[PDB]
Amino acid sequence: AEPHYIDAQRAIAPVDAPLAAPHEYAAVLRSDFVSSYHDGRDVWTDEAAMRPASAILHAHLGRPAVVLDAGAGRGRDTAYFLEQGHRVTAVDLVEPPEWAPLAQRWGERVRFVACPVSELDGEARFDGALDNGCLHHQHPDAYGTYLARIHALLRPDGRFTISVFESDGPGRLYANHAQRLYREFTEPELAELLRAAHFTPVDSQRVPRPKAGLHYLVMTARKTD
Numbered sequence: 001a002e003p004h005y006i007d008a009q010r011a012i013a014p015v016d017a018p019l020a021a022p023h024e025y026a027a028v029l030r031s032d033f034v035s036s037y038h039d040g041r042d043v044w045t046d047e048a049a050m051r052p053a054s055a056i057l058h059a060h061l062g063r064p065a066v067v068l069d070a071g072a073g074r075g076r077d078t079a080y081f082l083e084q085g086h087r088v089t090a091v092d093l094v095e096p097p098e099w100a101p102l103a104q105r106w107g108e109r110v111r112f113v114a115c116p117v118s119e120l121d122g123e124a125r126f127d128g129a130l131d132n133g134c135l136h137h138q139h140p141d142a143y144g145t146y147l148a149r150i151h152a153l154l155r156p157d158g159r160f161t162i163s164v165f166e167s168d169g170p171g172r173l174y175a176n177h178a179q180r181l182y183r184e185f186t187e188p189e190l191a192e193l194l195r196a197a198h199f200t201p202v203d204s205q206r207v208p209r210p211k212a213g214l215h216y217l218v219m220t221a222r223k224t225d
């Protein structure tokens with residue numbers, strides 16, 4: 001494992017020190033994202049390679065439905081889903097100014113919540129859920145509770161689409177200069193994680209990130225029977 005650029009601006013290096021506890025990490029996590037969005041360093045928002053994941057989830061739904069956008073950012077994917085006729089709930093640690101014009105365009109068809117995914121209450125409220133680059137920044141000790149919440153929020157025939165950094169070789173854990181964590185996955189590793197969280201993968205796609213010289217791994221799953 002060696003340091004490498006993960007996006008236009010940020011180099012990430014393998015973690016070697018002991019990880020901050022999940023409680024302290026949640027603060028490191030929010031701090032980097034609010035600074036990145038404030039500064040306009042959310043280079044993922046306009047990355048072309050980020051667009052296929054939402055179309056992939058819709059393809060697995062096949063009809064207008066009720067969709068959770070987990071870690072929705074500025075709302076690009078939320079807008080995409082709303083244009084397909086979905087009712088969308090968009091959730092993020094950081095509320096960007098773009099949520100207001102989205103609310104003005106789509107009215108009651110969109111709901112925004114500025115909270116952690118883990119805070120979302122309810123069960124069996126969604127037909128689909130999109131995680132477009134959120135899970136792979138969580139504390140590893142929080143993967144299970146994060147995925148369990150998504151699992152509980154989906155209806156029995158729900159579909160979950162998740163996009164992660166694809167690893168070259170066995171995936172490892174990295175951190176950026178702000179100490180935000182980055183996990184890269186191989187397809188077997190991501191499939192193993194979803195299966196352990198009681199999801200059954202039904203699709204996976206290697207989405208090129210041409211300007212970054214990398215790939216996203218975009219996997220779609222149903223609940224395990």
Ligand SMILES: Nc1ncnc2c1ncn2[C@@H]1O[C@H](CSCC[C@H](N)C(=O)O)[C@@H](O)[C@H]1O
Binds near residue numbers: 045077092
């Ligand atoms: N535990 C958590 N709960 C909710 N949102 C989270 C989170 N951890 C990270 N995030 C949010 O997840 C996003 C990852 S960046 C990807 C943003 C968006 N999905 C897009 O496609 O452009 C950031 O907006 C970050 O604020």
Ligand SMILES: O=c1[nH]c(=O)c2ncnnc2[nH]1
Binds near residue numbers: 007043044133
């Ligand atoms: O720092 C980040 N850079 C990225 O390119 C990215 N892409 C998807 N999700 N999170 C990201 N975080």
